[PDB]
Design a protein around this ligand. Structure first.
Ligand code: B12
Ligand SMILES: CCCC(=O)SCCNC(=O)CCNC(=O)[C@H](O)C(C)(C)COP(=O)(O)OP(=O)(O)OC[C@H]1O[C@@H](n2cnc3c(N)ncnc32)[C@H](O)[C@@H]1OP(=O)(O)O
Ligand SMILES: CCCC(=O)SCCNC(=O)CCNC(=O)[C@H](O)C(C)(C)COP(=O)(O)OP(=O)(O)OC[C@H]1O[C@@H](n2cnc3c(N)ncnc32)[C@H](O)[C@@H]1OP(=O)(O)O
Ligand SMILES: Nc1nc2c(ncn2[C@@H]2O[C@H](COP(=O)(O)OP(=O)(O)O)[C@@H](O)[C@H]2O)c(=O)[nH]1
Ligand SMILES: C[C@H]1O[C@@H](n2cnc3c(N)ncnc32)[C@H](O)[C@@H]1O
Ligand SMILES: [Mg+2]
Ligand SMILES: [Mg+2]
Lengths: 157, 1064, 233
């Protein structure tokens, strides 16, 4: 419950912060240069937590990742490319992981904290990035140890 | 290299069978392997196929029979072939799961070469089957050719057909050849050559001219037709597609042979030999059709006595006519497709050009042998005019003919002033595409405004909370209040009030919102978004409002019906008595009676049941056999059709107006009987009039009748396309006049288009396009958009493809937006209601238990996406009509989802989903682009003219099927995860028709006929006069079905409405 | 840590999920009080749930993952491997009946679907049959997963649940419902203190009876059992 209270508060902050800087850019586009807005904006940069600030910051980079046809990620000294697209008979590109198209940074942060993509805290949509491709266990147990073993050896041949 | 010999095939679908998806992908592999294929198309009797194969002198026959009655059908064919010198011709068949293994062994033992099961297709592969089929027919037929002309000259048409196969292959003796030409010279028979540009209508015009010859001369003339189509030298074989357009050649005095060019030329290298062969066979007239010739091509001229150049009004500039060699030699010129734009100006250019080429300056340009014809139009006066001219010319050229019985009219130009869609509105589909895209552009702009407006006032409130009051922000805010539209401003304003409505436990006229689980969780019927951004709110409210609000993306109604579930099970087997049992079986335990009627192949083609094995074997199979009004009454006995909780969905296309008239008469007669019982007396003339009128208004149900999809998808069109559309409008006009506000005049469908092989995008696009065509058709016909649009029903298919998940919601939005913005119709018209039926092709004969899994998933996304009506397929889908046990499993799928399934307690679970919204957008745009592709082909009608839809469907069908056998596209139990046993479905129970039931229908028919034997001829005459005098056809049908059978009515209309011309 | 038997005994999805997470947390507290480190046993902890027809089952796994991840990070300060809750889902066997056994494949399909949608780690599918597990019956059960994973179109997407207004609201509701149940067990002396009173056993038995009641009541429709019954058998 405490975590969710934080999501609400941090969202309101991230939302207000965007609303301010948005109005600031619109005023300068009309001529009026009121930095009084910026003072309230910078005030909410500190109000936002460290983790929350980095979440929103990585969001545009996050979008470009799940956008393409592949997912390039380098572990150790090599790399691990993963396909994102599965194409239908009609020729439609079905993305493995579909990202939200919110403009409100309040909704973005709210979503990133409550239900991040698969493979990211709090792992709501899954604990792994992408599902494993290709896992059926072989259950056997009857009679004495000899019969159960044979069934094991037979199935797992 | 292809085959060793010149291998020829005759391919067709069985009698009253529309299933061409199978047979079409076979004639494609046949052609590619190097076989000349004479394709006959769908709906072919044994008499038709056998006559064809015998005249063409082919090695093999390929038939697809999915309607059943195949055992009787193929036996008839085998018998008929042996009886008329065709024992050596091998017959091949296929019907998927319909033809059970026992019947295959029986038919193959009877004489059929091979019949392929779906399991055969898997093992052998698509190419493997055709290879096996071709290798069998790789034989030399020249050994059967006559050595002397004795047989041929005597009148033997079979010997003639074989002599041609000898002459064509050059295996004919030189002394025989010269002896043939010698007698051909002394024969002195006229030879009419018909050449022209590709697809101008050479075949269609030829058929019509022959029909004129038959009507005018009482079938006294013996006509020989030699049609030539171009051959692809790559494969080796060709697609001889001229015979498929010929409907008037089915007669003993008519003979037709299809020849491939067998060169890069527009005439067969042995054409003079073939012509001479027909001349010696004592024919009264020989007609020769060439292939698509260019501007500077005219090789038909030296081989014929008279030449006819066929063209379309589309020839570009008027200077182009000076480049056409054929305009310099042609004795007659026929400007076909005179319904097209600029036909009159086309005639005045061509006429003046022919006048110049002949240097007849002392004559009038209007006197030149240039004719304006419309072969597509039944009994076209233009074509008749051309005929009269050809007669006069053939008469002077030594051809005895009796004084004609046809209207010896005067003029050179057709007066066919009928139009379905005016050329001014030709690009209607493209406009609709623009309308939708324009709407979305507005959503983007209005969102940005609403977003900015909020951001400003938000910052304004935060500044005043800190002290610094800057009214400069407010100036920009008030600036965007005006920028926002009136409708958009009210949308956001009602949003907080909207939230409070769907928040509580009731919707205040009060409706419950909450369904509580066993765990005690409150599952709201409609879940609203929790956005803070007013930009997202407005964006959502404009793109996907709640169910029951524009653009009705999540449904056209606020909440799903309380008692009447969307369930509506397709049914039909045996006679009207047995089906009436199945209706009561499905609708048992349901207060709301939702019936869905399936008719047998014979009724679907407007024919009466008959003793001939062609027809008899199909009676009561694949659907209920309905032939008379009395059958229709029995069908719905015990069902109050005028009851508000009872709706009937008849699936009928070609004879739909006739069947509808039977249904209406039944619904009326029910209330007349109900009155006679509640008062113990017959209603007075005034009382009955009030009753009859009331029935028409409140009767609830749906008739399919979508003819646009018939040409494109289902092939149940019996009359000419233009005639069917004419009568369809008559129905809608009848409905408007009598205020039939509950019955749906047409179920604009795409299920059939999809089952033929079209992917979800093509299905949805074509179907909406067809629907919009009807709209444009009725609008150009003088009906208010709000008068017919609420009566428009839709029908779709749900398969496994991802797009099917959002098919319905896309259809609803595209309709709602266009109906509002483009056509300016009211709310009732913006609401697209549709029926979804699970994909039948997605179910297989192998491991039939797996089909219930697929049918479940498909049923799910239909209910999720808030469909209006749902049909569920049985597990034995591939093999038989749903059994008693089988229909309950199919019926349970809906019952379990609706009642047991937890997520289903929510009515908009799709909404919000990132995948669903993105897919909805993608599919929508994909459809719009397809609209534009059809629009640049002359609209839906203009595209059908080219066979664009049919071409695109059959291509996609092949692409899918190539992958099914391939393995690239996994199908569990078919191409992967096979059974270690290898048994596709022991002995399963089948839904065939009783012998007694067939005899019952025959006896009931002959009894009905005897009852109204007096008024029969008189009524049918009135019906034809209704077409001639161009009155309302359906209005007469409302009386006609009382004294006439289905067959009588259909065949009567054939004399005055024409028959459908197949389109490959 | 299992919760299959708890649900199979009659517990509704809320009770099942709550008790199971509570049991898991008990093991955590148990191992911690032996002076052990949280990153040493938490990655080895596996879970085992049931998927029935109830609406809550659609979001059961995602709720379990979030409650675990948040608590393991904030409360116990464990690492990433420990915050990740892996679980096996097995379709409800109770939900399948002896009457009209062909209908069971329909229910088992729907239950298998929401498991895969909600990105489960391991899935078992129940046969249509009552009788012995025949090799034919197990193939129909095994085909359900094969068809969804390979043939089903929506399944090509790995997060189709995300975004859905219903799913997100249900996720929140179930989560809080579980938390309240934690508090009910906590005020009974923890899981062990509750077992001392037979609180879980009592509550499960109470819910099993309530289900079995509405079933007989005709209030909770079961196709082929209390409605749409076989006209021949
Ligand atoms: C697609 C389809 C339709 C489409 C037709 C589209 C079209 N243009 O062809 C639509 C939706 C229009 C339709 C309508 C109807 N259909 Co239908 N349809 C089907 C369906 C789903 C598949 C048939 C198909 O095309 N399969 C694709 C082919 C390529 O594959 P296959 O059949 O497995 O064939 C293989 C081998 O056998 C071999 N083979 C097959 N034929 C041939 C031919 C040759 C020459 C060769 C060499 C090989 C070969 O090639 C394939 C290799 O894999 C079947 C059910 C099913 N899935 O079996 C019902 C089915 C055939 N139809 C049926 C019925 C009843 C109808 C209707 C009459 C219903 C009605 N009462 O209104 C209507 C009207 C038809 C008409 N127009 O006259 C019933 C038949 C019942 C019976 N005969 O006992 C079926 C079995 C469905 C059912 N269980 O109710 N249909
Ligand atoms: O099989 P297993 O359970 O024994 O797993 C072995 C290791 O692989 C990992 N794994 C399995 N499925 C995965 C997936 N979809 N995405 C990412 N990692 C995945 C799994 O975590 C395990 O690794 P580790 O030993 O825990 O580091
Ligand atoms: C041969 C190859 C295989 C095939 O082709 S099989 C072909 C199978 N085809 C079919 O079964 C087609 C079935 N479809 C139809 O009959 C129609 O398209 C249709 C519209 C779905 C019929 O559904 P119905 O149940 O009759 O619905 P309806 O719109 O006519 O409703 C009648 C009036 O009742 C009210 N109503 C219905 N649903 C409501 C709701 N949810 N909330 C509030 N009011 C509602 C409403 O007043 C409506 O009338 P209106 O809207 O005032 O005009
Ligand atoms: N709009 C229109 N189409 C026609 C007319 N006559 C024939 N067609 C169509 O043109 C197409 C090709 O006809 P076809 O006889 O095969 O031409 P051919 O291959 O050159 O001999 C078919 O779709 C016909 O229905 C006509 O008078 N008007
Ligand atoms: C075209 C589709 O229509 C359905 N269909 C065709 N005929 C019947 C019938 N008599 N009963 C039920 N469903 C039928 C099948 O599901 C088929 O695949
Ligand atoms: Mg032609
Ligand atoms: Mg031609």
């Amino acid at each position: 419950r405490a975590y969710h209270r934080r999501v609400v508060a941090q969202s309101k902050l991230a939302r207000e912060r965007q609303q301010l800087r948005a109005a600031h850019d619109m005023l300068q586009g009309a001529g009026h240069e009121s930095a009084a807005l910026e003072t309230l904006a910078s005030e909410r940069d500190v109000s936002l937590g460290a983790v929350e600030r980095k979440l929103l910051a990585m969001w545009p980079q996050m979008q470009q990742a799940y956008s393409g046809d592949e997912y390039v990620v380098k572990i150790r000294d090599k790399e691990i490319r993963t396909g994102l697209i599965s194409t239908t008979l009609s020729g439609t590109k079905i993305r493995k992981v579909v990202l939200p198209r919110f403009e409100d940074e309040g909704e973005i942060l709210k979503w990133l904290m409550r239900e991040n993509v698969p493979g990211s805290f709090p792992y709501t949509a899954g604990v792994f990035a992408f599902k494993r491709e290709g896992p059926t266990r072989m259950f056997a147990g009857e009679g004495d140890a000899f019969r159960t073993n044979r069934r094991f050896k037979l199935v797992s041949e | 290299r292809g085959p060793a010999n010149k291998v020829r095939f005759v391919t067709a679908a069985s009698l009253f069978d529309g299933h061409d998806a199978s047979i079409n992908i076979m004639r494609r592999i046949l052609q590619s392997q190097g076989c000349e294929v004479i394709h006959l198309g769908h709906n072919r009797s044994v008499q038709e196929v056998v006559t064809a194969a015998l005249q063409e002198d082919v090695q093999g026959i390929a038939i697809s029979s999915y309607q059943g009655g195949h055992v009787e059908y193929f036996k008839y064919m085998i018998d008929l072939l042996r009886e008329h010198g065709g024992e050596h011709i091998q017959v091949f068949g296929g019907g998927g799961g319909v033809i059970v293994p026992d019947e295959i062994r029986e038919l193959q033992a009877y004489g059929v070469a091979r019949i392929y099961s779906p399991e055969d297709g898997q093992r052998m592969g698509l190419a493997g089957m055709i290879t096996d089929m071709a290798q069998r027919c790789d034989i030399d037929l020249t050994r059967y050719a006559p050595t002397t002309l004795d047989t041929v000259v005597a009148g033997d048409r079979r010997a003639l057909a074989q002599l041609i196969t000898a002459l064509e292959n050059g295996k004919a003796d030189p002394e025989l050849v010269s002896a043939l030409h010698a007698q051909a010279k002394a024969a002195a028979v006229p030879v009419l050559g018909i050449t022209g540009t590709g697809g101008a209508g050479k075949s269609s015009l030829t058929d019509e001219l022959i029909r004129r010859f038959r009507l005018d001369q009482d079938d006294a003339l013996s006509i020989a037709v030699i049609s030539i189509d171009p051959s692809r030298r790559k494969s080796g074989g060709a697609l001889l597609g001229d015979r498929i357009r010929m409907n008037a050649i089915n007669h003993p005095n008519i003979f037709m042979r299809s020849l491939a060019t067998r060169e890069a030329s527009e005439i067969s290298q042995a054409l003079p030999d073939v012509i001479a062969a027909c001349k010696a066979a004592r024919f009264d007239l020989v007609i020769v059709e060439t292939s698509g010739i260019g501007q500077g091509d005219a090789a038909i001229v030296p081989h014929v006595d008279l030449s006819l150049y066929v063209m379309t009004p589309e020839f570009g500039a008027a200077s182009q006519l000076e480049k056409i060699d054929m305009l310099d030699f042609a004795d007659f010129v026929a400007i076909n497709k005179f319904d097209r734009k600029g036909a009159q100006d086309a005639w005045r250019d061509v006429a003046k050009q022919v006048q110049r080429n002949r240097e007849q300056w002392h004559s009038r340009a209007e006197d030149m042998p240039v004719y304006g014809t419309q072969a597509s139009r039944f009994n076209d006066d233009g074509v008749t005019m051309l005929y009269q001219g050809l007669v006069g010319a053939l008469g002077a050229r030594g051809m005895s003919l009796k004084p004609g019985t046809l209207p010896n009219l005067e003029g050179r130009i057709s007066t066919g002033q009928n139009v379905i869609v005016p050329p001014a509105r030709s690009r209607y589909l493209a406009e609709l595409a623009d309308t939708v895209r324009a709407y979305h552009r507005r959503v983007v702009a209005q969102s940005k405004l609403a977003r900015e407006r909020q951001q400003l006032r938000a910052a304004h409130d935060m500044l005043q909370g800190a002290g610094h009051e800057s009214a400069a922000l407010e100036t920009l805010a008030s600036e965007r209040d005006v920028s926002l539209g009136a409708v958009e401003r009210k949308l956001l304003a009602m949003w907080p009030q909207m939230q409070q409505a769907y928040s509580g436990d009731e919707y205040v006229i009060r409706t419950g919102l909450i369904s509580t689980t066993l765990s005690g969780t409150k599952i709201r019927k409609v879940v609203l978004p929790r956005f803070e951004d007013e930009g997202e709110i407005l964006k959502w409210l404009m793109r996907e409002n709640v169910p029951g609000s524009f653009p009705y993306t999540a449904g056209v109604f606020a909440f799903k019906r309380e008692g009447e579930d969307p369930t509506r099970m397709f049914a039909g087997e045996g006679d009207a008595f047995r089906t009436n049992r199945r209706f009561k079986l499905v609708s048992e335990g349901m207060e709301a009676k939702r019936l869905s009627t399936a008719f047998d192949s014979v009724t679907l083609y407007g024919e009466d049941p008959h003793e001939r094995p062609d027809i008899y074997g199909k009676v009561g199979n694949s659907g209920v056999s309905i032939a008379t009004l009395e059958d229709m009454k029995v069908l719905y006995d015990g069902f109050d059709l005028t009851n508000p909780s009872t709706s009937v969905s008849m699936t009928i296309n070609g004879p739909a107006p006739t069947i509808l008239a039977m249904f209406m008469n039944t619904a009326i007669d029910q209330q007349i009987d109900r009155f006679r019982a509640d008062n113990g007396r017959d209603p007075t003339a005034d009382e009955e009039a009030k009753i009859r009128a009331w029935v028409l208004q409140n009767v609830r149900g749906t008739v399919q009748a979508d003819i646009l999809k018939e040409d494109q998808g289902q092939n149940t069109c019996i009359f000419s396309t233009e005639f069917s559309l004419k009568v369809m409008g008559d129905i809608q006009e009848y409905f408007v006049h009598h205020q039939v506000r509950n019955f749906y005049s047409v179920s604009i469908s795409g299920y059939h288009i999809a089952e033929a092989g079209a992917n979800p995008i093509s299905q949805l696009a074509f179907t909406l396009a067809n629907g919009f065509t009807y709209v444009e058709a009725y609008l150009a016909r003088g009906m208010h958009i709000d008068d017919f649009a609420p009566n428009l029903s839709f029908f779709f298919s749900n398969g496994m493809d991802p797009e099917y998940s959002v098919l319905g919601r896309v259809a609803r939005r595209i309709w709602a937006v266009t109906m509002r913005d483009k056509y300016g119709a009211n709310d009732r018209s913006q609401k697209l209601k549709y029926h979804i039926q699970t994909s039948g092709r997605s179910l297989h004969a192998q491991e039939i238990d797996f089909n219930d899994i697929r049918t479940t998933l498909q049923a799910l996304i239909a209910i999720y996406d808030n469909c209006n009506s749902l049909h569920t397929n049985a597990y034995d889908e591939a093999i038989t009509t749903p059994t008693a046990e089988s229909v309950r499993r199919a019926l349970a799928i809906q019952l379990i989802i609706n009642r047991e399934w937890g997520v289903a307690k929510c009515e908009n679970p799709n909404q919000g989903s990132f995948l669903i919204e993105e897919l909805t957008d993608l599919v929508e745009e994909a459809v719009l682009q397809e609209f534009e592709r059809i629009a640049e082909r002359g609209g839906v009608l203009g595209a059908m003219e080219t066979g664009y839809q049919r071409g695109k469907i059959q291509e996609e069908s092949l692409y899918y099927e190539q992958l099914k056998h391939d393995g690239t596209l996994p199908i569990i139990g078919v191409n992967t995860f096979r059974n270690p046993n290898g048994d596709p479905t022991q002995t399963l129970e089948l839904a065939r028709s009783s012998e007694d039931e067939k005899q019952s229908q025959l006896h009931r028919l002959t009894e009905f006929h005897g009852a109204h034997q007096a008024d029969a001829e008189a009524m049918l005459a009135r019906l034809r006069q209704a077409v001639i005098d161009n009155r309302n056809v359906f209005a007469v049908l409302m009386d006609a079905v009382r004294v006439c059978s289905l067959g009588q009515i259909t065949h009567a209309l054939f004399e005055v409405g024409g028959q459908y011309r197949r389109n490959m």
